[model samples]
Target: RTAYNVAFDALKNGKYDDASQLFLSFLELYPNGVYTPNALYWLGESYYATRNFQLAEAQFRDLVSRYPTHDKAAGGLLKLGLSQYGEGKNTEAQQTLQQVATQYPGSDAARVAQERLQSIR
Candidate 1:
């Protein structure tokens, strides 16, 4: 818990490399921990911040597929769309972002996804 909290703090402060390392360590140490979904989401964010869109996409996809009902899954979908966009997969990004907007209508993720979808259009 301490490691997760510290890693999240690092993430919030833009210490992406440290956050990545910490999140990875946490995942390794507690693969099935209650916070795994959150860790995966933050790790994906760290990769995104570093412009490692491929890895970020993979992480977000994994999170979405593995924990579809988790709170972070919607966020993961939003990031997945953005990651796909970063990788120049604009069509796929649009589809994924559309899913977020349609499926999670009232969520903040959906709001951002809608904005991004408009920008991409």
Candidate 2:
């Protein structure tokens, strides 16, 4: 809990490297912790902030695959798709974004993914 709190603070302060480390530590300590979803989510965000798009995509994809029922999974999926898009994998991005929309209808991520898909289309 303390690790997650500190990590979140680091993220808020744009200390992505520190945040990523802390979150990774937390996940290692408590893989099934109540904050596991948050830990993974923030790790993905940290990677994204650092412009490590491929790593970010991998993290988000792992998050969604490991915790599809997580409250943040929809956003993870969307971000994963965006990371793919950043890498010019439009076909993969489109497929992933479509899954986000279909799996989490009415979510903000779903809406954004739909809009992104429309533009790409």
Candidate 3:
């Protein structure tokens, strides 16, 4: 399989450190591969799973903003908000989640966002 698949497999196996490193290397080697979006999304997800909210926010924010219309964008934004919340950026998290709830109404991501919004306030 491809490097992307390798990294993704590491993530699915809950090897966050390995997954992060592999995904980083994969992104470096294949900067704009067709799997670029998934790589970025999962890299952020790895950071989130490790409680590295700062790094997680970085990846999630970049992924969502850089690929707004992509299928992963909504989930990226949702994770970005969670990362911000984990980092204690309450206002930013609220705003980010608000945007997700409004921007992608009726989606599972939006539902989660709204649930998180209620938890915040």
Candidate 4:
């Protein structure tokens, strides 16, 4: 928990590499923690910061697949879709983002996904 807080603070301050290391370490420490969803989300963001779109998408997919009931699963779906788009997988991105919106409805992530979907269309 303490390690997670430290990593989360580092992430908030944009120390992405450090945050990634710490978050990954946290995952090792608490694979089934209540905060696993958050750990996965930050891990995705860390990968995103480093322009590792494939890894970022994979992390988000893990979050969505493992924690579908998580509050931020929709955001993970949105980011996963965006990462796919960035990787030139537009068809996959469209499908994923559409799933985000359709599944989450009025969520902020769903709205963002909808906007992205509209732009791409």
Best model per lDDT? 1
lDDT of 3 by residue, 1-121 (tens): 8889899999999999999999989889967778888899999999999999999998888888778888999989999999999999999999999999788888889999998899898
lDDT per residue as tens, model 2, 39-76 = 88889999988888987987898889999988999999
TM-score quality measure for candidate 2: 0.92
Question: Regarding lDDT, does 3 or 4 come out ahead?
Answer: 4
Could you give the candidate ranking by TM-score, starting with the highest?
3, 4, 2, 1
Give me the runs in candidate 3 sitting further than 4 Å from their true place: none
| Descending-lDDT candidate ranking | 1, 4, 3, 2
On TM-score, the candidate that comes out on top is 3
What is every candidate's alpha-carbon RMSD to the true fold? 1.3, 1.3, 0.8, 1.1
lDDT computed for candidate 2: 0.90
True-structure Cα RMSD, model 4? 1.1
lDDT of candidates 1 onward, in order: 0.93, 0.90, 0.91, 0.91
Question: Candidate 4 has which clashing residue pairs, if any?
Answer: none
Q: Which scores greater on TM-score, model 1 or model 4?
A: 4
lDDT score for residue 34 of model 4: 84
The reply for model 2, stretches above 4 Å from the true place, is none
- Per candidate, the number of residue pairs that clash is 0, 0, 0, 0
Candidate 1 regions off by >4 Å?
A: none
Cα error of candidate 4 at position 70, Å = 0.9
- In candidate 4, stretches whose alpha carbon ends up further than 4 angstroms from where it belongs are none
